[PDB]
């Protein structure tokens, strides 16, 4: 039913909410009661990650109401983060700043469960360039702290982090990111 219920939600996504005969919430609330028992299979978590945030109904309450309890049952797979890297795409839809904050909070919290952390590590710059956002910085910093490797410490990223520190204020998240980059190739020094 969990897969079928989210295809039913997708059916609501192909049409306007006013034109729909049934509530968009109630089905997602039944899904939430399911999550209280079993949250999302790997394919199910992938699907509910990719569609519910791009452009469709995905209400900033309803999208977050899922994203709070949208975590994986087994783990998160490569295809989960792929099409939701097109949710960090940050445009006409943008998954607006409150759901974006919740998205990066989810990416930090469920970062312990990825089948291949190397693939996301190869997506380092995509999250690093989202660090310019003030609202996303306290969580993108944590994500990059869990995402970092030596291949992602290019000197332009070091000077971008220094520019962020100079433009913004002294922050424990930026301080943690800078101390970690100093732990790697020391193009910057900070204690």
């Amino acid at each position: 039913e969990e897969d079928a219920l989210q295809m039913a939600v997708g059916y609501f996504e192909k049409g306007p909410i006013k034109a729909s005969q049934n509530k968009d919430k109630t089905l997602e609330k039944h899904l939430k009661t399911v999550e209280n028992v079993a949250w999302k299979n790997g394919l199910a978590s992938e699907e509910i990650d990719i569609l519910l945030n791009i452009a469709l109904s995905g209400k900033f309450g309803n999208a977050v109401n899922t994203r709070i309890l949208k975590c994986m049952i087994p783990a998160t797979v490569i295809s989960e983060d792929s099409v939701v890297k097109a949710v960090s795409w940050l445009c006409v839809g943008k998954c607006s700043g409150s759901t974006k904050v919740l998205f990066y909070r989810w990416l930090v919290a469920m970062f312990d469960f990825i089948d291949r952390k190397e693939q996301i590590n190869l997506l380092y710059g995509f999250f690093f360039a989202s660090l310019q956002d003030d609202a996303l910085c306290p969580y993108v910093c944590h994500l990059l702290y869990l995402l970092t490797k030596k291949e992602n410490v290019k000197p332009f990223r070091v000077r971008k982090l220094l520019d962020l520190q100079a433009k913004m204020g002294m922050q424990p998240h930026l301080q943690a990111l800078l101390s970690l980059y100093k732990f790697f190739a020391p193009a910057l020094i900070s204690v």
Partner: protein, 302 residues
């Protein structure tokens, strides 16, 4: 050969075979090869806080600029917790031709306001030279004049990047009296400062100090009274100079300076303390004053 030799050196030093050394009188040292007159004269009348620095691992007197950059980016980093760092080899502050060339570390702040000017040297230090491997550039001496806050931070940077460690050199009253005796035994002329020996009586409630500040010529004619073997100074001669001080102080004040300890020996050659803030280097005998200081830093190292 490379390590067991240091083992034998340590064993011999701890064995304490008779060590009243007939050290030669400090000889007037003509400024050898290329010693920068401005730089050397800048290092003379400046109070160096003595340190004993273990050999710098993987050190090279070719990579000066990149070490300067790494240390400058670390000094201003500790301010985060305006400043320039210029590593400068000195080219002539060495006793033997095989000694590692002395190099400076100066914290230069707009203009050349040298804040810290730390200084590493190895002069007549061939007792640690022949015990380190080729990767270690052994500089037993460390000479920092700036504030202790900057010294105890550049020391941490040096520990982190060279595995070299800074024990603060403390000249005991024995070595202090020794260097007091040989620095009045020099053939210097136009004595810069009075030969002062700052004593400190060991009182528990009070902290009285004494400054036996001889006229430098009167301390030379007094040394010639206790100088019999030429060229070399004996521990008997050093103790006789100190005992002539003792029996000329107790003759007046009836207090035993021998019951006290030296804390500073100001001399026209070089002033010297005990607590570490030791080397004022008035005269250009410094290749011998620093020779004693390195051979004393080697002792703390080994």
């Amino acid at each position: 050969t490379p390590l067991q030799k240091r083992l034998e050196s340590v064993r011999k030093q701890s064995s304490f075979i008779l060590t009243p050394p007939r050290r030669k009188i400090p000889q007037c040292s003509q400024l050898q090869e290329d010693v920068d007159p401005q730089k050397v004269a800048f290092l003379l009348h400046k109070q160096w806080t003595l340190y004993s620095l273990t050999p710098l691992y993987k050190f090279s007197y070719s990579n000066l600029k990149e070490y300067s950059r790494l240390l400058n980016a670390f000094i201003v980093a500790e301010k985060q917790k305006d400043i320039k760092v210029i590593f400068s080899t000195l080219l002539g502050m060495k006793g033997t031709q095989r000694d590692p060339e002395a190099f400076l570390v100066q914290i230069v702040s707009r203009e050349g306001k040298v804040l810290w000017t730390g200084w590493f040297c190895c002069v007549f230090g061939d007792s640690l030279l022949e015990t380190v491997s080729e990767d270690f550039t052994c500089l037993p001496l460390f000479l920092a004049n700036g504030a202790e806050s900057n010294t105890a931070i550049i020391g941490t940077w040096f520990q982190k990047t060279f595995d070299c460690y800074f024990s603060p050199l403390a000249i005991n009253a024995f070595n202090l009296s020794w260097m007091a005796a040989m620095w009045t035994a020099c053939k210097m002329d136009h004595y810069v400062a009075t030969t002062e020996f700052l004593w400190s009586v060991p009182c528990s409630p009070q902290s009285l100090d004494i400054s036996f500040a001889i006229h430098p010529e009167d301390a030379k004619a007094l040394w010639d009274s206790v100088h019999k073997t030429p060229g070399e100074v004996t521990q008997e001669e050093v103790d006789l100079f100190m005992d002539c001080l003792y029996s000329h102080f107790h003759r007046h004040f009836k207090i035993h300076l021998s019951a006290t300890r030296l804390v500073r020996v100001s001399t026209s050659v070089a002033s010297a303390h005990t607590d570490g803030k030791i080397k004022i280097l008035c005269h250009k005998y410094l290749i011998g004053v620093l020779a004693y200081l390195t051979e004393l830093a080697i002792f703390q190292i080994e």
